[PDB]
Design a protein around this nucleic acid. Structure first.
Lengths: 102, 68, 38, 148, 190, 140, 145
RNA sequence: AAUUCUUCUCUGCGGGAUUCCUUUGUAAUUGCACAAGGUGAAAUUUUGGGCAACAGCAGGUCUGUGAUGCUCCUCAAUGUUCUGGGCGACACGCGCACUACAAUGUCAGUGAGAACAAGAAAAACGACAACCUACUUGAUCAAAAGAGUGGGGAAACCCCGUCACAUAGACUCACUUGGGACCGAGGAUUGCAAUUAUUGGUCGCGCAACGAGGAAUGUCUCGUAGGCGCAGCUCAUCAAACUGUGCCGAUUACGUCCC
């Protein structure tokens, strides 16, 4: 069961602060891991007129997000992944991942 | 013929209200064994000009801006 | 389509991405994680 | 080469200019550039016509008989103008002055009978939308409201 | 040169060319090119306009009044037809005719307001090299849309008809008629 | 015996594949040089071959992958991939001199390939219409 | 050393040389109603004449180069401004309609079917004469007419 | 169908740009600098934006909001109603702002044919799938429709028109083989209900103006105007609106203070 990791979180130094750091719990240990690069970045773009009212200089906001997806790939440890992900505590808003395929 | 082909020696300056015409000192282009220069007759040019422009003058020997 | 923060059903509300924040405006309602760039 | 004649040709009770294309001149007869692939199923075989064949090489007199009662010729109903009719079964054509005589019967009931856009329509103001007003530049006559 | 250095419009002769008039001579484009459509940053700077083939400059200046217009590629079609009509009218390299048709087109001298603050006043002002280049092509092809607007039996010929004439200096061309009529407003005022 | 290279204009991406042979002619993005439809692009896409060395230098079997632009920017994407594509070889498989002759003859020709000449359409902005064009005033 | 399109410029050629081969050969199929417009928002009569006569090999050279397609994808080749459109901006859409019938023609006659493209691909061979045999005064070389 | 790869794509963090040489240049013993030129992908706040002081304006909002002071209403109510029906949108060609269409022979109208683009979206709980789209049937007979199968929670998608086409295509000194308005007949569709919701729906009306626009007025300089077009937002249904992406791609000034 080669497993898969999709880490989707916005915030600065989370998407990095797990996959970069926290796979070296598996990366440099008994697991053998297949790193790809993170998938492409998205922006979620809403634009609302700044005026609560009618009057304006016809001005608009543009508000954005960034969602950061990382794919990280494995061979099959059994029950280690349950230990793998659980090694490392450090982040917030970052995403836990349970995947099987092939 | 009427073509008497001079050089701009220099842009003697911007001249006029809009930004268009520019005062220029003209070196008559024609050279002969009895070299006929003016030597220099100031002219006003219509449109953009530059350091080595060939300016053929159909109305020659007019003394330019003087007055205004 | 009454919407989230107020009775409104007016100040037409963004359906975009199904977050319905316009009631109290997505300006007043924030921390959503949006930013002001460009 | 030889053109014995060109003229006007009255086809169905109508003055039709001789135009070096047949369908496009047949257009004036209240048929329309859609209805002139009928020029095949109006039982002429000639192609890219000149005023060399109406009657002469169309035996035309039949062709303008096709533009009326076409079911006797090989034609779908999807092209027929009045398709199924409120007074009777279809006249497979709107053609010539038979159109407006039926208009003068039809043109009462909607424009009699009230509507918002339809009575706009009945007075011909505006198609689909809430603009009536700065609609109409470059000229005189658009739309006009008098209760005095 | 076995079509290596030398150039062809499709197959055409760009080498034997020069401008006649020492006034605007030696700055005007003397062509080595194939197609008038090229893309570069054409005028980033101040006098960069004088470098590229008039063939472009015309083809570039080729279709104002955009309505559903394709411009350069639509233009180059028209200039396929335009040149050919011209050389085997005029029995010359139409690269010459066009080159010869630029110069006779524009006025050498102009009359402007030098008047101060609402006063409409005159001076004789002397046209500059890039203005005989520029205004020629500008008005040269302005004769097209006019001669070309409705009464045409004439599809491309309009462009041929004011390049031919100007290269002959004739006063019929909408090109040259303004070269003179401006100078009826020039030597008159001065 | 190969290299590979990429053409770019605006978004249009050309990619130059490279194979070797001295007798051969090039397909368009998908279709041979001769038969590309708007003449007035062909003679351009001739310039890569024709101008500088027409024949003495390259018949090389060459294919190109062009995606990311409309038709003409894909004709400028292409030729660059060739001039880039060709210059690649004489650095890998040939002497500086044969290269130095070629890329000079390009340099004088124009920026046939010095670069994509980077120009990308401006983002539309604010209430500004398209870019730099303003929603128009009235009763001013 | 001859491929589909690619040697040919099948714009008005590799079609038309196939067309006569489709029409003059009695073999193929033309359904009954031609009175109806093939193409998006066209009030102009479907053409002057020869309506399917532009249509079929498109679908073949559509099949061939684009491999798998269908009713939905192939009208991407059927083009229109969709402009009759009345006092509004024009917009753009393709034709699903005759598609099925169009591709039934190749569902008969030696060209593969309810999934793929073709069987024997005559297109090369029956097209292999284009560089050989020119319509337009094809120049070729001084050897070939 | 086996092989090896990172040219093309993905992205976090980095490199790169600086006034750096040159011009005895302009100016100038200083200085701060400028220019034409060089190198470079980029050459002068690199480019487009976001941000943005201090004072104010009886600027707009009490229709955004358990955000609020009064003081009017308080039950045959100015409250509420998946409350019922009607309006907000009406025809004196009224006057005005902004936009879309366009009348040409420069696609010009249209019929076919060849190529190729990009930011963007897509979904359901206190129940036992309601979003899109590809395929192929609807197809022995219109179009749009109907229906069945198939995976996508988003890197399920890439055939958009402008253009290219001489394909030897049709027009053809004209209000016209160019306005699509007004028009009455059928028919498919979203859904509590469409009496014009709307439409590659047909097909009739064309004979309604209209034929470069009076004074007057708009906004910008390089991938720019203009042209073209695509999604998004509203959205059960509807874009001539706005928001953003991309394609085609310009002439004129590299200036002055005259307005």
């Amino acid at each position: 069961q080669t497993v898969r990791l999709t880490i989707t979180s916005r915030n600065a130094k989370a998407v990095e602060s797990v996959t970069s750091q926290l796979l070296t719990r598996a990366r440099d240990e008994k697991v053998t891991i297949h790193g790809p690069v993170r998938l492409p970045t998205r922006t979620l773009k809403i634009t609302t007129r700044k005026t609560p009212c009618g009057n304006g200089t016809n001005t608009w906001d543009t508000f954005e997000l960034k969602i950061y997806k990382r794919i990280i790939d494995l061979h099959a440890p059994t029950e280690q992944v349950k230990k793998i992900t659980s090694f490392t505590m450090e982040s917030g808003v970052d995403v836990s991942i349970t995947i099987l395929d092939r | 013929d009427q073509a008497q082909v001079g050089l701009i020696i220099k842009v003697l300056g911007r001249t006029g209200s809009r930004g268009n015409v520019t005062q220029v000192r003209v070196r008559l282009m024609a050279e002969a064994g009895s070299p006929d220069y003016n030597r220099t007759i100031v002219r006003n040019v219509k449109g953009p000009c530059k350091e080595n422009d060939m300016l053929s003058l159909m109305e020659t020997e007019r003394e330019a801006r003087r007055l205004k | 389509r009454c919407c989230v923060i107020c009775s409104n059903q007016k100040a037409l509300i963004r359906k975009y991405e199904l977050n319905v924040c316009r009631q109290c405006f997505r300006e007043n309602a924030e921390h959503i994680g949006f930013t002001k760039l460009r | 080469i030889p053109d014995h004649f060109q003229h006007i040709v009255r086809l169905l009770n109508t003055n039709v200019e001789g135009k070096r294309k047949v369908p496009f001149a047949l257009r004036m007869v209240k048929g329309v550039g859609i209805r002139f692939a009928y020029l095949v199923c109006k039982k002429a075989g000639i192609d890219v016509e000149r005023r060399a064949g109406t009657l002469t090489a169309e035996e035309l007199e039949k062709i303008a008989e096709i533009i009326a009662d076409p079911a006797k010729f090989k034609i779908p109903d999807w092209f027929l103008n009045r398709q199924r009719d409120p007074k009777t079964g279809k006249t497979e054509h709107l053609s010539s002055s038979m159109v407006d005589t039926r208009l003068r019967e039809d043109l009462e009931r909607l424009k009699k009978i009230r509507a918002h856009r339809g009575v706009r329509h009945a007075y011909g103001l505006r198609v689909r939308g809430q603009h009536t007003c700065t609609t109409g530049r470059h000229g005189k006559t658009v739309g006009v409201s008098r209760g005095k | 040169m076995s079509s290596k250095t030398p150039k062809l419009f499709n197959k055409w002769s760009f080498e034997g060319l020069e401008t006649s008039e020492l006034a605007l001579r030696d700055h005007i484009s003397t062509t080595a090119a194939y197609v008038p459509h090229t893309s570069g940053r054409w005028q980033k700077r101040r006098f960069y306009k004088a470098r590229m083939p008039i063939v472009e400059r015309l083809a570039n200046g080729l279709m104002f009044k955009g309505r559903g217009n394709g411009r350069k590629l639509q233009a180059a079609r028209l200039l396929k037809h335009t040149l050919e009509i011209i050389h085997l009218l005029t029995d010359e390299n139409p690269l010459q005719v066009v080159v010869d048709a630029v110069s006779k087109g524009a006025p050498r001298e102009d009359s402007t307001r030098v008047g101060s603050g609402g006063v409409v006043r005159r001076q004789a002002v002397d046209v500059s090299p890039m203005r005989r280049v520029n205004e020629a092509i500008y008005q040269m092809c302005k004769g097209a849309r006019e001669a070309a607007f409705r009464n045409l039996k004439s599809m491309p010929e309009c462009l041929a008809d004011e390049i031919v004439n100007a290269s002959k200096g004739s006063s019929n061309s909408y090109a040259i008629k303004k070269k003179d009529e401006v100078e009826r407003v020039a030597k008159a005022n001065r | 015996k190969q290299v590979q290279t990429f053409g770019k204009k605006k978004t249009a991406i050309a990619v130059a594949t490279v194979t070797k042979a001295a007798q051969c002619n090039i397909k368009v993005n998908g279709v041979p040089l001769q038969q590309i439809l708007p003449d007035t692009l062909r003679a351009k896409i001739m310039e890569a071959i024709t101008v500088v060395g027409s024949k003495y230098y390259s018949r090389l079997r060459i294919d190109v992958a062009v995606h990311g632009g409309g038709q003409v920017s894909q004709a400028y994407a292409a030729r660059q991939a060739i001039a880039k594509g060709l210059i690649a070889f004489f650095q890998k498989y040939h002497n500086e001199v044969e290269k130095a002759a070629l890329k000079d003859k390009f340099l004088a020709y124009d920026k046939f390939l010095l670069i994509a000449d980077p120009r990308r359409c401006e983002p539309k902005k604010w209430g500004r219409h398209s870019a730099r064009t303003r929603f128009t005033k009235s009763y001013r | 050393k001859i491929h589909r399109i690619g040697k040919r410029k099948g714009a008005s050629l590799k079609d038309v040389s196939a067309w006569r081969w489709i029409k003059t050969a009695a073999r193929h199929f033309k359904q009954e109603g031609k009175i109806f417009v093939p193409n998006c928002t066209e009030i102009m009569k479907s053409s002057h004449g020869r309506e399917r006569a532009p249509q079929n090999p498109d679908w073949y050279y559509i099949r061939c180069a684009a491999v798998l397609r269908a009713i939905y994808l192939r009208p991407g080749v059927g083009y229109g401004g969709l402009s009759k459109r009345f006092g509004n901006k024009k917009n753009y859409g393709s034709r699903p309609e005759h598609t099925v019938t169009s591709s039934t023609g190749p569902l008969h006659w030696a060209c593969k079917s309810l999934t793929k493209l073709g069987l024997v691909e005559p297109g090369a061979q029956s097209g292999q004469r284009l560089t050989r045999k020119g319509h337009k005064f094809a120049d070729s070389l001084a050897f070939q007419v």
